[PDB]
């Protein structure tokens, strides 16, 4: 029986919190719109502060109406559905319309250009893999010079790869509540019935050296897991039932620590093929056990010998002292 | 470190053709990062590593021979961990 | 008394090797040339193979004539002589003449462009931090079309930062034996009597986050240490008296292991200020002792607590279990 | 993680002004990555860290006060390592 050990779940991270008793009044739920399913931007208070939003997100564990989530997720595809990859990595050039639904893990985003704040609700979050909130600055003073009309207080991202730039990718919701994200260009794995995956994340199984550092652009680390943040439910609704884990990145020489959620349920077949590469480093460094991402592994060989040692039934464990 | 199957890269501890530097009838030398696995006839078995660079069939380490360098091999990626 | 523990030295890595008895006949020595000191390219056999060069370098431990080395090294400056740094990193643009002598640790190189093989003796090594040799390909077939005249089998590098590109920087000597190197653009630490350091390596003391991954470009990791390779003796003559250490890099998600030399002597003042950042990782991952570069440290906190613990008299050791 | 001296960045374990989140007259709270050091009058000393986020003066952990957040303080980078 496949299960985890260190998997923390925030589904019932509450008790006797009935002071608000109803979603702190900004109830969130999905609504269809001409065959498209986005969040109900109408009620959906928008001008909250960081503390108010954090309080609002604390109460959001139970009242989320799981009705449109499956048919909305029908657009997303597993990593198997794509085709193989080979050759040296090349940076893709995303241009023109992008019909694909951005909430899928395998969505290739556009470069993170300037964006006015008149068409965004809630904070915008960039991912130097840990998440960071991004502020703004007035548009009248600088020569950006009125992208829209009499607008103000405009966001700007303009970041390269985090080893050189500032963040991998950023995400938010636009004024009508639809998810909007951008990031660094992803990797093309073919230039140098199925569809051609453009690898916005660590596509290890479909390409061997397409690591997150080289290819990752966005909150997705693996096709199964992602980096969590207070507005994760705010942006992506369907990831509510995920389970949390602690992650240590070590990106670009600097040290990064955060938490990650995963689309993991007990009993999933995870024999040998459903393992994805991800780069963790030990948090305690001792006890020879590593709480690594479920259905995954790390390129850190064992103490005495090499060869990744992983358990039959519990997948979050990485073994040392082989 | 990885092998090819049904158009899907998969992690393994089997050595590639390029990961082995020298091999003899009873000893293989290889770059660290894999483990040798050999098939002779309807029988593929695993090779015991000591000082991981060099691996031996059975523990009798102390004339090259091309021993089929196959990768239909599962061992050492589930340790079968004995209690520590 | 300041000393090291794991420092391996190849000064006398020989015994009863008198079969050649004189440098395998390709004697190396430094000669002045109109006020410039380079290697005597005249005898200096050139068309050797890898094995022949490796055999040649094995015997090269004693006959090196320490005459021009100090006055040649007078051009180089310590990290203290430069000025402070601040602000976000920006990629410098090296153009025009470069009067500075390339063998100094703080030499900013040009981008690694194409280079014909008609003006290079010995192999050319790029540094994805571990060293790699670079091959060639004939100039006739490709439309690069005869940079010089009837020249053949040219070298091309054309690499970005190793997380995206292929290597940090590469080094060789040209036909007249003068050292020639190139690499990725370094960091400018001022744009965003002394001289402005352009940071071709991990200039931690002069700029806090100017790490090797972001800023380093070339074989130099620290102003004191460098990555060793079989032709280090060939290229840089004055680094004869260095001591070797084992290094684990873990760059760009992949794992890198190699050896490093350092300009270290017993008794150097190394109280607290002469420590340079260097992203190391454990080789044995046990015994709570880290074999780190002398007069340096790593950003890997301790097991139970944090705060880099280093010894008073032995600098190569990084302590755990604080 | 580092401090400024004579135009030269130098490693240290002293907390910056931005590395401390909350401080009381007997307890400091801070982001992991440093250790608090405090000067009162012609006397500066370290603060005992337990569960590195929070630090105590003496071991008596169980009303904010701005305790001078100063960094002319050496300790915790030379462990004075007791034989393990
Ligand atoms: C996360 O896990 C919870 C717990 O299982 C899921 O809630 C459950 O979702 C199913 C699927 O819709 C519900 O079954 C349906 O319930 C409706 C209303 O009761 C009924 O009319 C249908 O015939 C069907 O039985 C189930 O009731 C519901 N249980 C609870 C306690 O909420 C949730 O869907 C999961 N969400 C995601 C995104 O995975
Ligand atoms: C978490 O992982 C589960 C398991 O893969 C995901 O459920 C799967 O969702 C896909 C997408 O809709 C389903 O595929 C579709 O199935 C229908 C009906 O068979 C088919 O007509 C479509 O063509 C498409 O193949 C899949 O059946 C479903 N599997 C299970 C066991 O539920 C889930 O969506 C993932 N959630 C997140 C947030 O990642
Ligand atoms: C917030 O983001 C959503 C998601 O893209 C935006 O919805 C999209 O809005 C555009 C223009 O408003 C729509 O394009 C228009 O529709 C036709 C339909 O055929 C299209 O062919 C044309 O290009 C035409 O311009 C697009 O259909 C629509 N998509 C969805 C799924 O709703 C929304 O406008 C954004 N809101 C703001 C304030 O930026
Ligand atoms: C690496 O270490 C060796 C061992 O100390 C150094 O060799 C020594 O270098 C000194 C400095 O030139 C030599 O002293 C001079 O020797 C010449 C010729 O004997 C003499 O005419 C001068 O008056 C002066 O005494 C010393 O002899 C020499 N010893 C040996 C055994 O070679 C070497 O210089 C060091 N190299 C570097 C780059 O630091
Ligand atoms: C290894 O480190 C030692 C110690 O710093 C280096 O020796 C030092 O080399 C510099 C450069 O020539 C010397 O500075 C010069 O000194 C002369 C005479 O005092 C002065 O006129 C110049 O203006 C310049 O300041 C320094 O004195 C010298 N110190 C010692 C103790 O030898 C050595 O060059 C380094 N070698 C390598 C390969 O990195
Ligand atoms: C190998 O590399 C060395 C190091 O740069 C080359 O030496 C340099 O060669 C150039 C042209 O061959 C010399 O430039 C010429 O000299 C005057 C001197 O004022 C200069 O102002 C002009 O620009 C003129 O073109 C340069 O002075 C010289 N530098 C040194 C230190 O020797 C050498 O030529 C290279 N050899 C090959 C075969 O590539
Ligand atoms: C979800 O969206 C619907 C619109 O499709 C919102 O319904 C309207 O809400 C306003 C604001 O209270 C009312 O004045 C209207 O009478 C509602 N119309 C209908 C048909 O219900 C609904 O409020 C949204 N839910 C929120 C914001 O929580
Ligand atoms: C979740 O949202 C769905 C939206 O379709 C709700 O389903 C509708 O419920 C209303 C009244 O409750 C009725 O018009 C129909 O039963 C549904 N309309 C459809 C399917 O078009 C569902 O009731 C909501 N559930 C919760 C618990 O909020
Ligand atoms: C472990 O070894 C098996 C056989 O020893 C290899 O192939 C698998 O064999 C099982 C048994 O029928 C099949 O169900 C799997 O589909 C086979 N794997 C594949 C990829 O086809 C294989 O080396 C290892 N097992 C797996 C699942 O990879
Ligand atoms: C090292 O090189 C120097 C180069 O100057 C040699 O010094 C020369 O030695 C020869 C004879 O040995 C004299 O004729 C020259 O006058 C010397 N040069 C100067 C500038 O005085 C030195 O002999 C060499 N030593 C070794 C051991 O090779
Ligand atoms: C350790 O503490 C000393 C004093 O407690 C600090 O300052 C150093 O003091 C010594 C004694 O005179 C001087 O020689 C050093 O130059 C001082 N350091 C500096 C950077 O000026 C300092 O906090 C620690 N020592 C050092 C060398 O940093
Ligand atoms: C028709 C068009 O706009 N093509 C664009 C080109 O302008 C741009 O320089 C390039 C960047 O990679 O992407 C593509
Ligand atoms: C006069 C001159 O050549 N200036 C160059 C410019 O052409 C080049 O585009 C730039 C690249 O950073 O470096 C500078």
Neighbours of A156 (CB within 10 A): 16
Could you give the CA distance from residue A226 to residue A242 in angstroms, rounded to a whole number? 10
A18 touches chain B (CB under 8 A): no
Q: Return the residue whose CA atom lies nearest to atom 34 of ligand 5.
A: C73
∠ CA C238-C240-C245, rounded to 5°: 120
CB B74 within 8 A of CB B45: no
Alpha-helical regions (H) of A116-272: 212-215, 232-235
**Plot region of C63 (φ>0 → left; ψ -120 to 50 → alpha; else → beta):** alpha
- Taking an 8 Å cut-off on Cβ atoms, the answer to whether C310 and D78 are in contact is yes
**Could you give the 3-state DSSP secondary structure of residue D55?**
strand
Q: Report chain C's terminal Cα–Cα distance, integer Å.
A: 23
Neighbours of B5 (CB within 10 A): 13
Alpha-helical regions (H) of chain A: 50-58, 69-73, 212-215, 232-235
Which atom of ligand 12 is the closest one to the Cα of A93?
12
Residue ranges of E strands in A49-197: 90-91, 121-128, 130-134, 169-173, 179-183, 187-188
Burial A50-86 (b: 16+ CB within 10 A, else e): eeebeebbebbeeebeeebbeebbeebbebeebebbe
Burial A6-43 (b: 16+ CB within 10 A, else e): bbeebeeeeeeeeeeeebbebebbbeeeeeebbbebee
Q: What distance in Å separates residue A276's CA from the closest CA in chain C? A: 14
Neighbours of C59 (CB within 10 A): 19
∠ CA C227-C296-C80, rounded to 5°: 95
Residue in chain D lying closest to C273 (CA): D10
Q: In angstroms, what is the C-alpha Rg of chain D?
A: 13
Residues in contact with A158: Cβ distance below 8 Å, sequence separation at least 6, in sequence order: A112, A113, A114
A86 touches chain B (CB under 8 A): no
Distance from Cα C278 to the centre of ligand 11, integer Å: 23
- Chains A, C: CB contacts within 8 A come to 57
Which atom of ligand 13 is the closest one to the Cα of C185?
12
> What are the structure tokens assigned to A35, written together?
């065959």
Residue ranges of E strands in A84-218: 90-91, 121-128, 130-134, 169-173, 179-183, 187-188
Give which of C92, C214, C277, C285 to mutate to test A binding, by max A Cβ within 10 Å. Answer: C285
Could you give the CA distance from residue B47 to residue B54 in angstroms, rounded to a whole number? 10
Distance from Cα C123 to the centre of ligand 6, integer Å: 21
Q: Report chain B's terminal Cα–Cα distance, integer Å.
A: 26
Distance from Cα C73 to the centre of ligand 10, integer Å: 19
Could you give the CA distance from residue C297 to residue A72 in angstroms, rounded to a whole number? 50
- Taking an 8 Å cut-off on Cβ atoms, the answer to whether C206 and D8 are in contact is yes
| Residue that is written with structure tokens 């010079």 in the block | A145
Chains B and A touch (3+ CB pairs under 8 A): yes
Please name which ligand lies nearest the alpha carbon of A72: 2
For C279, the closest of A209, A253, A299 (CB atoms) is A253
Could you give the CA distance from residue C95 to residue A262 in angstroms, rounded to a whole number? 49
Maximum C-alpha span of chain B:
41
A163 touches chain B (CB under 8 A): no
CB A84 within 8 A of CB A126: no
Question: In whole angstroms, how far apart are CA C81 and each of C71, C206, D7?
Answer: 18, 10, 11
For C306, the closest of D9, D11, D32 (CB atoms) is D32
Question: In whole angstroms, how far apart are CA C179 and each of C37, C170, C172, C236, D28?
Answer: 11, 11, 6, 8, 55
Could you give the CA distance from residue A122 to residue A83 in angstroms, rounded to a whole number? 37
CB A103 within 8 A of CB A236: yes
**Structure resolution in Å?**
3.4
Quote the DSSP letter at residue A215.
Answer: H
Torsion of CA C124, C128, C131, C137, to 10 degrees: -30
Torsion of CA A44, A47, A48, A50, to 10 degrees: 120
Neighbours of B75 (CB within 10 A): 17
CA nearest neighbour of A184 among A216, A222, A207: A216
**Could you give the 3-state DSSP secondary structure of residue C258?**
strand
CB C269 within 8 A of CB C315: no
CB within 8 Å of chain C, chain A residues 210-269: 211-214, 250, 252-255
Residue in chain D lying closest to C208 (CA): D9
Contacts of A300 in chain B (CB under 8 A): none
C80 touches chain D (CB under 8 A): yes
**Could you give the 3-state DSSP secondary structure of residue D46?**
strand
Could you give the CA distance from residue D80 to residue B4 in angstroms, rounded to a whole number? 53
Q: What distance in Å separates residue B25's CA from the closest CA in chain A? A: 23
Q: What distance in Å separates residue D5's CA from the closest CA in chain C? A: 10
Catalogue the long-range contacts made by C64-68 (C-beta closer than 8 Å, 24 or more residues apart).
C64/C28, C64/C29, C64/C237, C64/C240, C65/C29, C65/C30, C66/C240, C67/C30, C68/C30, C68/C31, C68/C32, C68/C37
Q: What sign does the CA torsion over A156, A157, A159, A165 have? A: positive
| CA C205 from centroid of its chain's CA atoms | 18
∠ CA B78-A258-C303, rounded to 5°: 70
- Taking an 8 Å cut-off on Cβ atoms, the answer to whether D10 and C205 are in contact is yes
CB D63 within 8 A of CB D24: yes
Q: What distance in Å separates residue A147's CA from the closest CA in chain B? A: 46
Residue ranges of E strands in C6-111: 30-33, 36-39, 90-91
In this structure, the strands spanning C90-91 and A296-297 are: unpaired
Measured in residues, chain A has a length of 322
CB D3 within 8 A of CB D69: no
Q: What distance in Å separates residue C40's CA from the closest CA in chain A? A: 40
- Taking an 8 Å cut-off on Cβ atoms, the answer to whether A285 and C299 are in contact is no
∠ CA C158-C164-C168, rounded to 5°: 55
A232 touches chain B (CB under 8 A): no
| Residue that is written with structure tokens 């969040």 in the block | A39
Q: Which helix (H) or strand (E) holds D9?
A: strand D9-11
In this structure, the strands spanning C276-277 and C296-297 are: parallel
C305 touches chain D (CB under 8 A): yes
For B11, the closest of A301, A308, A311 (CB atoms) is A308
Residue ranges of E strands in C167-232: 169-173, 179-183, 187-188, 225-227
A84 touches chain B (CB under 8 A): yes
Could you give the CA distance from residue C37 to residue B30 in angstroms, rounded to a whole number? 43
**C195: buried, middle or exposed (CB in 10 Å: 19+, 13-18, 0-12)?**
exposed
- Taking an 8 Å cut-off on Cβ atoms, the answer to whether A273 and B10 are in contact is yes
Could you give the CA distance from residue A281 to residue C248 in angstroms, rounded to a whole number? 14
Question: In whole angstroms, how far apart are CA A158 and each of A110, A112, A215, C246, C292?
Answer: 11, 6, 18, 39, 37
C254 touches chain D (CB under 8 A): no
**Does C272 sit in the ligand 11 pocket, CB within 6 Å?**
yes
CB C220 within 8 A of CB C200: yes
For A213, the closest of C163, C209, C301 (CB atoms) is C163
For A305, the closest of B1, B52, B84 (CB atoms) is B52
Could you give the CA distance from residue B67 to residue B73 in angstroms, rounded to a whole number? 14
Q: Return the residue whose CA atom lies nearest to atom 28 of ligand 11.
A: C272
């Amino acid at each position: 029986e496949t299960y985890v050990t260190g998997g923390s779940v925030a589904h019932s991270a509450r008790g006797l919190t009935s002071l608000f008793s109803m979603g702190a009044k900004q109830k969130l739920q999905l609504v269809n719109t001409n065959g498209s399913w986005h969040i109900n931007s109408t009620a959906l208070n928008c001008n909250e502060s960081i503390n108010t939003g954090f309080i609002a997100g604390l109460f959001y564990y139970h009242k989320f109406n799981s009705t449109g989530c499956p048919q909305r997720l029908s657009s997303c595809k597993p990593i198997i559905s794509f085709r193989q990859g080979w050759g040296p990595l090349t940076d893709a050039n995303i241009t023109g319309p992008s019909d694909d639904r951005p909430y899928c893990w395998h969505y290739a985003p556009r470069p993170c250009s300037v964006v006015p704040a008149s068409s965004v609700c809630g904070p915008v979050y960039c991912f130097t893999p840990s998440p960071v909130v991004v502020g703004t600055t007035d548009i009248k003073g600088k020569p950006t010079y009125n992208w829209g009309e009499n607008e103000t207080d405009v966001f700007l991202l303009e970041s390269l790869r985090p080893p050189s730039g500032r963040w991998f990718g950023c995400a938010w919701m636009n004024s009508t509540g639809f998810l909007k994200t951008c990031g660094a260009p992803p990797c093309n794995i073919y230039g140098g019935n199925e569809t051609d995956l453009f690898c916005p994340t660590d596509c290890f199984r479909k390409h061997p050296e397409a690591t997150y550092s080289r290819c990752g652009a966005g909150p997705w680390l693996t096709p199964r897991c992602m980096v969590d943040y207070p507005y994760r439910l705010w942006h992506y609704p369907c990831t509510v039932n995920f389970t949390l884990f602690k992650v240590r990145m070590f990106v670009g020489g600097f040290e990064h620590r955060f938490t990650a959620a995963c689309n993991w349920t007990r009993g999933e077949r995870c024999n040998i093929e459903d393992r994805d590469r991800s780069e963790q480093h030990p948090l305690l460094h001792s006890t020879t056990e590593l709480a690594i991402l479920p259905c995954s592994f790390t390129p850190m060989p064992a103490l005495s010998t090499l060869g990744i040692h992983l358990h039959q039934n519990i997948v979050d464990v990485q073994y040392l002292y082989g | 470190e990885w092998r090819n199957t049904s158009g899907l890269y998969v992690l393994t501890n089997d050595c590639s053709n390029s990961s082995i530097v020298y091999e003899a009838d009873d000893v293989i030398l290889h770059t660290p990062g894999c483990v040798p696995c050999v098939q002779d006839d309807n029988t593929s078995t695993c090779w015991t590593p000591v000082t991981p660079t060099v691996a031996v069939r059975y523990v009798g380490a102390t004339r090259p021979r091309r021993h089929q360098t196959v990768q239909t091999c599962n061992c050492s990626l589930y340790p079968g961990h004995v209690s520590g």
